[PDB]
């Protein structure tokens, strides 16, 4: 009978709707759910049904590939006509599990099937017309989310999925689609999450829109069947090798922005902000952020903006903003109407998008204080609090910030402190971990080096198995200016961020506390800036980031020394000239 299902004289959906074929594959589905073999694992689905009936779970989960092995055409019919096939798979799963767990219908009326690990993946820009009425798997970001309400009852919810922040082509707004979520699949995600969902792609706005206007139009939606929120050993064979190489930290820093000369105290600050620290949440107490905050203040030139353009491409999820081009609404949240539930719905801004990512604010000084106040509370609380249009809620905004600014009058006053060179108020300055102060002072020593670098940078980036040949040539040029190929570094950073969570050793407690007390003693001795605990909190974070560079699970003494160097150097360099020279001699050891 299984072979007879292959022989089809009609369309794919037409053949399935036949009662004999429907009952044929219903028996075929029923046979598989208990009969399977995975060598040592044997009938894994027998245990799957066992634990599912143990939990009385409504979510009937299945792996896609396993069905295609025992029942070759049964799985392919499921893919081409998911609605028709899952309709009877509801009953087959009910009867097959009732073989193991009878009287299941006594409590639960239906068994909605959750498909998993579907292999074919589509992006929001690849949804061709041929993909209509078919099972599809897409990945995106949760921008808009509705509440939970019953539907003609069972739970219902509606969500929008938006393109990946770092993949939008220039000149286009981010493409997005409406997604339909059913019962038992509600509250699976929250705004700002990056998720992959499997569902059916179809048009469903027929009815009232037809007679509403001439040349009527509809919209495309995705009926969420199952949603999900990944490495291989062959790649880890490369990451582990480089992780223990000599000068791994120096290879990373020297590979930040290859075509930018000098500014090594920024490049090390960019490198640390990419890897980040380790967030902590003590139960019954407050949490601790792990994101590294960088402030780039300097005279016109010095490529502060080009750094933020390099961070945009290298980081995983980068959201770029500008002080004047942004608004208070455009950062925190916005409000949309929804006729399905009739309550107001909230859509997140730029800070919500960059959750578990980096938020870039170019020309940070030029925005108004009301716009700047939102950014301050964003870095402090890592969340957005809003009370607008009757909606009171909080969203996750765990993002790292890299800011470029300009001093008052367009030139840095070397004889005055940083707290008196910019309009940025001191409480907002305290939210930064690394404060880089770039001066542009003339000298033939630096100018010949810088110019000969730039004049070679332009002659390098000059425009003019062929794909492999071009990639090899680009790799050659990457090696000529950087120690590490860039796309490898992108993968290298992602693995370190995802896998490595380096931990402290209490053996280094003396190394940390003694330096802090020594730094505190000099603060009252010389200078007006008092050393705060937040500096020590900054030292540990960057110390963890340095350990995360080596892919070592424990903090070493070497990482702490470089961690102490960066924070002390920034604190010293921000002081006025008279105080600056005194502190450099007092901290020659560090």
């Amino acid at each position: 009978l299984e072979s007879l299902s292959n022989v089809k004289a009609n369309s794919y959906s037409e053949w399935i709707t036949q009662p004999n074929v429907s009952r044929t594959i219903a028996r075929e589905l029923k046979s598989f759910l208990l009969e399977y073999t995975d060598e040592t694992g044997r009938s894994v689905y027998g245990a799957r049904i066992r634990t599912l009936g143990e939990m009385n779970s409504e979510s009937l989960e299945v792996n896609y590939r396993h069905l295609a092995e025992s029942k070759a055409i049964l799985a392919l019919f499921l893919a081409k006509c998911p609605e028709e096939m899952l309709k009877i798979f509801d009953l087959v799963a009910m009867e097959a599990t009732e073989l193991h767990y009878p009287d299941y219908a006594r409590i639960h009326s239906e068994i909605h099937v959750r498909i998993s690990d579907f292999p074919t993946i589509y992006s929001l820009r690849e949804l061709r017309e041929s993909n209509l009425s078919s099972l599809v798997r897409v990945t995106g970001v949760v921008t808009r989310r509705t509440g939970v309400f019953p539907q003609l009852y069972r739970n219902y919810q509606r969500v929008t999925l938006q393109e990946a922040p770092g993949t939008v082509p220039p000149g286009r707004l981010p493409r997005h689609r409406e997604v339909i979520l059913l019962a038992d699949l509600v509250d699976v995600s929250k705004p700002g999450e990056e998720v992959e969902v499997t569902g059916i792609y179809k048009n469903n706005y027929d009815g009232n829109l037809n007679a509403k206007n001439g040349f009527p139009v509809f919209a495309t939606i995705i009926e969420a069947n199952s949603i999900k929120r990944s490495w291989t050993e062959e790649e880890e064979r490369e990451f582990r090798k480089i992780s223990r190489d000599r000068g791994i930290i120096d290879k990373i820093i020297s590979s930040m922005a290859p075509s930018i000369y000098g500014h090594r105290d920024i490049k090390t600050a960019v490198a640390c902000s990419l890897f980040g620290g380790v967030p902590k949440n003590v139960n019954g107490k407050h949490s601790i952020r792990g994101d590294i905050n960088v402030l780039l203040l300097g005279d016109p030139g010095t490529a502060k903006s080009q750094i933020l353009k390099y961070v945009e491409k290298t980081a995983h999820r980068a959201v770029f903003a500008t002080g004047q081009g942004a608004s208070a609404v455009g950062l925190t949240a916005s409000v949309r109407k929804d006729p399905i539930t009739k309550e107001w719905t909230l859509e997140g801004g730029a800070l919500v998008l960059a959750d578990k990512g980096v938020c870039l604010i170019d020309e940070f000084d030029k925005m108004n204080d009301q716009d700047r106040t939102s950014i301050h509370e964003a870095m402090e609380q890592q969340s957005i609090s809003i009370s607008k249009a009757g909606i009171v809620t909080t969203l996750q905004a765990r993002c790292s910030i890299i800011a470029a600014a300009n001093p008052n009058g367009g030139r840095y006053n070397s004889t005055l402190p940083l707290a008196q060179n910019v309009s940025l108020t001191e409480p907002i300055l305290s939210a930064f971990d690394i404060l880089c102060v770039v001066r542009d002072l003339v000298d033939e020593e630096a100018d010949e080096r810088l110019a000969t670098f730039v004049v070679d940078s332009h002659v390098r980036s000059h425009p003019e198995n062929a794909r492999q040949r071009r990639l090899q040539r680009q790799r050659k040029k990457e090696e000529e200016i950087s120690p590490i190929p860039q796309e490898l570094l992108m993968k290298y950073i992602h693995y370190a961020r995802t896998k490595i969570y380096p931990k402290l050793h209490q053996m280094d407690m003396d190394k940390v506390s003694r330096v802090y007390a020594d730094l505190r003693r000099e603060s009252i001795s010389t200078g007006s800036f008092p050393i705060t605990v937040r500096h020590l909190e900054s030292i540990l974070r960057i110390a963890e980031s340095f350990a995360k560079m080596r892919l070592s699970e424990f903090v070493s003494s070497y990482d702490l020394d470089r961690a102490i160097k960066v924070v002390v150097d920034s604190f010293v360099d921000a002081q006025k000239v008279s105080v600056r020279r005194q502190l450099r001699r007092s901290f020659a050891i560090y």
């Binding site: 299984e2 072979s3 299902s5 292959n6 070759a72 055409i73 392919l76």
Partner: protein
């Protein structure tokens, strides 16, 4: 390679054919006394 885009008859049979090809070739190789190759040798693509 089948004359139709999809056929379950040529799915299990070719999967069994691969099993038969692999298992029989497994028995052929183990008869050798020299150092048996630890990995399947790579096919060489003929010029089109």
């Amino acid at each position: 390679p089948k004359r139709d885009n999809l056929t379950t008859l040529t799915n299990k049979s070719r999967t069994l054919a691969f099993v038969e090809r692999a298992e029989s070739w497994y028995q052929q190789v183990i008869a050798s006394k020299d150092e048996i190759m630890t990995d399947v040798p790579a096919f060489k693509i003929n010029k089109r």
